[PDB]
Structure 1
Amino acid sequence: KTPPVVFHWFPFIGSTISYGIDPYKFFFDCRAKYGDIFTFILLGKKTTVYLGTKGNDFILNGKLRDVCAEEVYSPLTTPVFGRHVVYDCPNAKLMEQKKFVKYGLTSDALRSYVPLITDEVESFVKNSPAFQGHKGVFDVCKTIAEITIYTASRSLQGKEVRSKFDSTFAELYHNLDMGFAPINFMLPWAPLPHNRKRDAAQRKLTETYMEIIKARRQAGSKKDSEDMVWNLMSCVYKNGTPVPDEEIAHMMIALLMAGQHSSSSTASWIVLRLATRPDIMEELYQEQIRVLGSDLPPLTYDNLQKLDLHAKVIKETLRLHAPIHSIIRAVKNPMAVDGTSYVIPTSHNVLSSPGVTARSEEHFPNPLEWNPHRWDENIAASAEDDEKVDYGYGLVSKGTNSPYLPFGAGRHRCIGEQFAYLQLGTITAVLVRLFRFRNLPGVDGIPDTDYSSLFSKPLGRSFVEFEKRH
């Protein structure tokens, strides 16, 4: 009834298994039979799926009274991030919170991050056992996750948090990260041992962050441009109340989780693709020689934006491997589709997957082929034509006519896109300077994508060859 119900075999499990294995293949098979609208039930709820640029526009630009993001996620995210932040509050408070973070991610702050990021990556390569010797292999996902957590903590989280990852922050975030698995999506409240560790880790992280805050106020000073010393001053809401340290702590935790899971996954895919394409890596290296010079001066916020192909590699990687595959909202009021007789009721969830349009033939010819040169049409870290609407933070292009929305659109769109492009590009440029990458003998292509966790990542333990240049 209403949108076409998918023909499945069982109650309550539905196609979740088909969805969990590969959402895109599942979304594509449903599109062949049902069109740009399906409705499949993953476990308990009814999830309506609207595909196409309209489908993304319908859900991402849905009216605030009609769709609800927090209700869908809050129970999973709130125990991990903490209270009063992000989803644990009305949408208005989220917009102010987004404002504070985007406030602290200005270009001058981004400028200060580049030398820090280069320092951490160079320090890692020299001190980490992952790249010792002229030639060898290395666990891509494990190594890359360490690099993204070092670069994000040093720049964004600050000195103390960066120092804390040398002792008892590693185990804290591993314990806290156990909160995410979608099993928690439904039973985030059950007192299973993994949830008890999550709660214990969340409390301990909060106490540590606030002590770092209290220590700074005891000195009443400030150093350089981290979102910690920012949220201390960027505390006043429109009502006139300063952001309490507890909220600051929980925001940092949220930024800590969101940045790492997204950066580690994408950067891993970047390294994996470059191993399959040695010609592309050598072309990246030649770009730095041509654009920056034979001397290869240190990377800065300025000379990074000249890298055109480096940006393309990130863009093409995001197109096929963006860690989020399903955006999901809770339907509050019944909504009429603009064109058809279909009506989406309240008992339903809505799911928009901009990745489907990002791998459609009509939008990208030969979509599954990873080719950064397809982007010789246009490049944009900040992108495009459509209208810009402000919901309380900056001015965000809610535009949907685009089939390429890795960071989403509308009032929830990502505010860490610039920081992500800064971090990914910097790490990539540094790794391009230092290494060549090859697959292990006999290995062709790339590993499959794991969709079982909230975030998607490469499937198993993937190793590739590294070879230093000098």
Structure 2
Amino acid sequence: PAGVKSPPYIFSPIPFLGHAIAFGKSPIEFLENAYEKYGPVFSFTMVGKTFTYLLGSDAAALLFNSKNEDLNAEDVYSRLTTPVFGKGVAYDVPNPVFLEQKKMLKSGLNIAHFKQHVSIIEKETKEYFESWGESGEKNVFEALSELIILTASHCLHGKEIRSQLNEKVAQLYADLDGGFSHAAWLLPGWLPLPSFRRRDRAHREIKDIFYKAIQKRRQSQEKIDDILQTLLDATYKDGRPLTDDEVAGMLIGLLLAGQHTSSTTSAWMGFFLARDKTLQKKCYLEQKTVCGENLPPLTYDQLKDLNLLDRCIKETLRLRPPIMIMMRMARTPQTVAGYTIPPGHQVCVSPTVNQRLKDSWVERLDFNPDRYLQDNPASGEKFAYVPFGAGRHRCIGENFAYVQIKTIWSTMLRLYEFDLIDGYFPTVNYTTMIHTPENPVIRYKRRS
């Protein structure tokens, strides 16, 4: 015991902003260079706050094993940066409660339901891309996100709600999250802020569609077995059932939480595959090898066996995780790689950086889905590959994501063959709140 034995602090010559600019410009590069000079654990200032980063699996442990009362999640957010769910749900309530609601939702996303989803997803994907004609050059990112709002609406909300979803309602979801929770690092909690009228309005409006549908279901009670159901049935350790709000709130939250994350990932995979033409063909041939030369309507059980397409996703998520930082506020001193983190610091982990770390991953920057066949830190280490989180803090909708993407990409990979427009592989765009692919226009043509 001595006093100051905290992690090395990187100084900035810019009094308040600190490193906010360098980080804002290119965070992964920033964080890598920092690792090289200061090791696995270090502090620095951005926009008045002190951040302490945990790099590599060993140190990343502290966050992944933490309890929300030592390393706090709600503390990280502003009225603006709070992830959108609803009143009385998620960040609007105490953690223990939020945890319970995630439980309820998790039990909703099960093998039973997934089986129903696969065919819905495939039908939607099939119908959507019909409008793409025989060939052309179009924005896959924009397509994929326009689609995923349909597919995920259907699977997670049920056909009553999905039927009500015209492009006027789709437009309202766009209003809902401008992606702000990804920007929490930049905007500190203390800033004065006006009401976000556009958001609060669309929420009110969308929430109202849910009331109308929670109505219809609670009346005629037939054989409908969807996520919506699971929820209505569910109750707390209370015994108390979910109010109508809670139901809509956590369902809206759920769709959003998965919306951008998925389209990012989907588009990126699309380009990786379009760049390595061999690999693309290969998991197209695996479509026949596994599913059968005639290409039947898709099933959940085939998905379990599309092992290349599975590694292509896994590998996409390694090089392009849609959630770049996981972030918690120190409320009680913590010990990591020798150091003590004083309460006050925002403790952070970067999926992107851990998954790319120069002394763990061979060929760090390479899109090689075969790497998971040899040895790798994915299995080798506890927390080197953590795109969905890890320990106590893992994404509830991990599995649905794999269902949704795999289906969509299969279906897509069937209808079309893809490649880059002029050898142009899309560059990362840090300028959107959630990192998007720069100019994601893709060339496609009918497959044979």
Do the structures match in fold with TM over 0.5?
yes
Q: 1:413 — aligned with what?
A: 394
Distance, in Å, in 2 between the alignment partners of 1:77 and 1:223 is 36
**Percent of aligned positions that are identical:** 39
Distance, in Å, in 1 between the alignment partners of 2:187 and 2:247 is 25
Distance change >3 Å, CA 12–CA 161, structure 1 → 2: farther
Deviation digits for residues 391-426 of structure 1 (CA, Å, limit 9, x no counterpart)? xxxxxxxxx624111100122211111100111111
Q: Is the 8 A contact 2:54 2:60 kept in 1?
A: yes
Q: Which runs of 5+ in 1 are unaligned?
A: 386-399
Distance change >3 Å, CA 107–CA 217, structure 1 → 2: same
Q: Is the 8 A contact 1:80 1:202 kept in 2?
A: no
Q: 1:363 — aligned with what?
A: 360
Give the C-alpha shift of residue 375 in structure 1. 2.0
Matches within 5 A, 1:64-463: 64-73=68-77, 75-76=79-80, 78=82, 80-126=84-130, 128=131, 131-132=132-133, 134-178=134-178, 180=180, 182=183, 185-186=187-188, 190-191=193-194, 195-225=196-226, 227-234=227-234, 236-337=235-336, 339-340=337-338, 342-377=339-374, 401-441=382-422, 443-444=423-424, 446-458=425-437, 460-463=438-441
TM-score normalised by structure 2 residue count: 0.93
Give the C-alpha shift of residue 9 in structure 1. 1.9
Q: Is the 8 A contact 1:450 1:457 kept in 2?
A: yes
Q: Is the 8 A contact 2:121 2:407 kept in 1?
A: yes
Distance, in Å, in 2 between the alignment partners of 1:423 and 1:189 is 39
Larger displacement relative to structure 2 (277-286 or 54-63): 54-63
Give the C-alpha shift of residue 119 in structure 1. 0.5
What amino acid maps onto 1:191 in structure 2? P
Larger displacement relative to structure 2 (419-428 or 159-168): 159-168
Q: RMSD of the alignment, in Å?
A: 2.2
Give the C-alpha shift of residue 125 in structure 1. 1.4
Distance, in Å, in 1 between the alignment partners of 2:294 and 2:375 is 29
Deviation digits for residues 212-268 of structure 1 (CA, Å, limit 9, x no counterpart)? 10122132335132x21221112x111111111101111011111111111111001
Larger displacement relative to structure 2 (176-185 or 342-351): 176-185
Q: Is the 8 A contact 1:141 1:268 kept in 2?
A: yes
What amino acid maps onto 1:159 in structure 2? K
SS of the aligned residue for 1:82 comes to: coil
Deviation digits for residues 146-182 of structure 1 (CA, Å, limit 9, x no counterpart)? 1211111111121122223214321211111236263
SS of the aligned residue for 2:9 comes to: coil
Work out the number of aligned pairs and report it: 441
Q: Is the 8 A contact 2:329 2:346 kept in 1?
A: yes
Distance, in Å, in 1 between the alignment partners of 2:116 and 2:81 is 30
Q: Which runs of 5+ in 2 are unaligned?
A: none
What amino acid maps onto 1:151 in structure 2? T
SS of the aligned residue for 2:301 comes to: coil
Give the C-alpha shift of residue 436 in structure 1. 0.7
Distance change >3 Å, CA 222–CA 454, structure 1 → 2: farther
Larger displacement relative to structure 2 (309-318 or 365-374): 365-374
Deviation digits for residues 284-310 of structure 1 (CA, Å, limit 9, x no counterpart)? 111112222221222100011111101
Q: 1:393 — aligned with what?
A: none
Distance, in Å, in 1 between the alignment partners of 2:330 and 2:345 is 6
Give the C-alpha shift of residue 321 in structure 1. 0.3
What amino acid maps onto 2:385 in structure 1? Y
Distance, in Å, in 2 between the alignment partners of 1:52 and 1:433 is 38
Q: 1:390 — aligned with what?
A: none
Distance change >3 Å, CA 177–CA 114, structure 1 → 2: same
Distance, in Å, in 2 between the alignment partners of 1:170 and 1:291 is 36
1:44 aligned onto 2:48: yes
Give the C-alpha shift of residue 361 in structure 1. 3.0
What amino acid maps onto 2:214 in structure 1? I
Distance change >3 Å, CA 3–CA 378, structure 1 → 2: closer
Distance, in Å, in 2 between the alignment partners of 1:350 and 1:373 is 33
Q: 1:396 — aligned with what?
A: none
Distance, in Å, in 2 between the alignment partners of 1:118 and 1:189 is 46
Distance change >3 Å, CA 80–CA 27, structure 1 → 2: same
Q: Is the 8 A contact 2:61 2:383 kept in 1?
A: no
What amino acid maps onto 1:142 in structure 2? E
Distance, in Å, in 2 between the alignment partners of 1:22 and 1:78 is 23
